[PDB]
């Protein structure tokens, strides 16, 4: 489906490409196969991200990466890519709003769940390759809010920083107040506890 | 990782150094040599600098800003506008012109910063290149007053004549390819 859409959206195929024209245009790779080139990259990138956030043609797992300095757009539909969900920031405002959390709060008898949040475009899954092209905010309120200017172009926000830890390290209370080898050791000791 | 900046040198210490000493490895990871100066050279920093220059390997590639291989049929023609003056001065009383002049030209520009840092001399470099390749290379060097340091090199005039009636059609590397090989060898192994 992504290849069909790319053909629709003014992507000249490698076979039809004059070799001179490649130099000034971005190369589009899908699953590691150089499908073609696109003369106007940013519009295509925005359209692909809109489609993924609406979940129309591009599935949520599909990751689009644009390397601006190297003039390459890479789209991976491959399996085994590790992804984490992140909140989406438009302008400097989080897309997640009080109406969404009100619907989630009454999750029972409203049939509103995480899938509805993904379909609404509030959250998105981002793999590491796409993480390289993403400006993240650790905490929404602190970083998004205007201050002494550090970054005014945040594109995503972390849901909560404590989610970097795994299952065994999540049982540690006040992990940030311990030495790191001690957290590592507790992760191993917790597997051997009795209960 | 946890040495100090006081050393100001790469030093292998700890278990790897113990293994190097225990196995008596032919090649240490960081071979080093501590040189103690004999007399006034120790007292004065400038004399120590002289000894440093004496002890540190320097090649033409370190002091060469750029190299260009030109084709100039006539030395008097001076295809490069800049070398017109000193080529004309040298050919007012030309040397080795009687044998011939090789048309292919190797023009080497030497960075003044590196040249003065190692305290090298243009005449010194010319003498070293002449000694290394014998008479097969003819070198023309600018005066130090010139803003750009230029060294012009041509194939041997006797070799250009070939000094042989048969002349052999082998034509090994012609002259341009031979000049490129000469440039690479000079840059890598000049040992000025």
């Amino acid at each position: 489906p992504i290849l069909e859409f790319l053909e629709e959206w003014s992507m000249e195929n490698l076979e039809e490409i004059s070799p001179a024209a490649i130099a000034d245009a971005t190369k589009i790779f899908v699953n590691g196969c150089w499908v073609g080139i696109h003369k106007d990259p940013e519009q295509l990138m925005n359209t692909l991200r809109k489609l993924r956030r609406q979940m129309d043609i591009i599935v949520s797992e599909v990751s689009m990466i644009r390397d601006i300095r190297e003039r390459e757009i890479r789209i991976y539909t491959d399996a085994g890519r590790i992804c984490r969900p992140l909140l989406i920031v438009e302008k400097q405002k989080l897309l997640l709003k009080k109406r969404h959390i009100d619907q989630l709060k009454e999750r029972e008898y409203n049939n509103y769940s995480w899938q509805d949040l993904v379909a609404s475009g509030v959250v998105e899954y981002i793999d590491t390759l796409e993480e390289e092209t993403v400006m993240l905010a650790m905490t929404p309120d602190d970083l998004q809010e205007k201050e002494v200017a550090y970054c005014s172009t945040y594109t995503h926000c972390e849901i909560h920083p404590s989610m970097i830890l795994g299952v065994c390290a999540s049982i540690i209370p006040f992990p940030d107040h311990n030495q790191s080898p001690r957290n590592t050791y507790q992760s191993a000791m917790g597997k051997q506890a009795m209960g | 990782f946890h040495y100090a900046g006081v050393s100001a040198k790469n030093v292998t210490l700890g278990v790897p150094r113990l293994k190097e000493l225990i196995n008596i490895s032919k090649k240490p990871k960081t071979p080093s040599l501590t040189v103690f100066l004999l007399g006034q050279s120790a007292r004065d920093a400038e004399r120590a600098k002289d000894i440093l220059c004496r002890l540190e390997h320097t090649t033409l590639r370190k002091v060469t800003a750029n190299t260009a291989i030109y084709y100039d049929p006539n030395p008097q023609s001076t295809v490069v506008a800049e070398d017109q003056e000193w080529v004309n001065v040298y050919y007012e009383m030309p040397d080795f012109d009687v044998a011939r002049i090789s048309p292919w030209l190797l023009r080497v520009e030497l960075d003044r910063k590196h040249m003065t840092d190692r305290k090298l001399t243009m005449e010194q470099i010319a003498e070293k290149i002449n000694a290394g390749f014998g008479d097969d290379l003819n070198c023309i060097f600018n005066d130090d007053n010139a803003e750009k340091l230029v060294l012009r090199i041509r194939i041997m005039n006797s070799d250009e004549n070939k000094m042989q009636e048969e002349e052999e059609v082998v034509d090994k590397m012609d002259d341009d390819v031979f000049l490129r090989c000469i440039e690479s060898n000079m840059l890598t192994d000049m040992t000025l």
Binding site: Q179, S180 | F1, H2, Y3, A4, G5
Partner: peptide, 8 residues
């Protein structure tokens, strides 16, 4: 975890 000269 201390510095460059100390320990990690």
């Amino acid at each position: 975890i201390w510095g460059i000269g100390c320990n990690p």
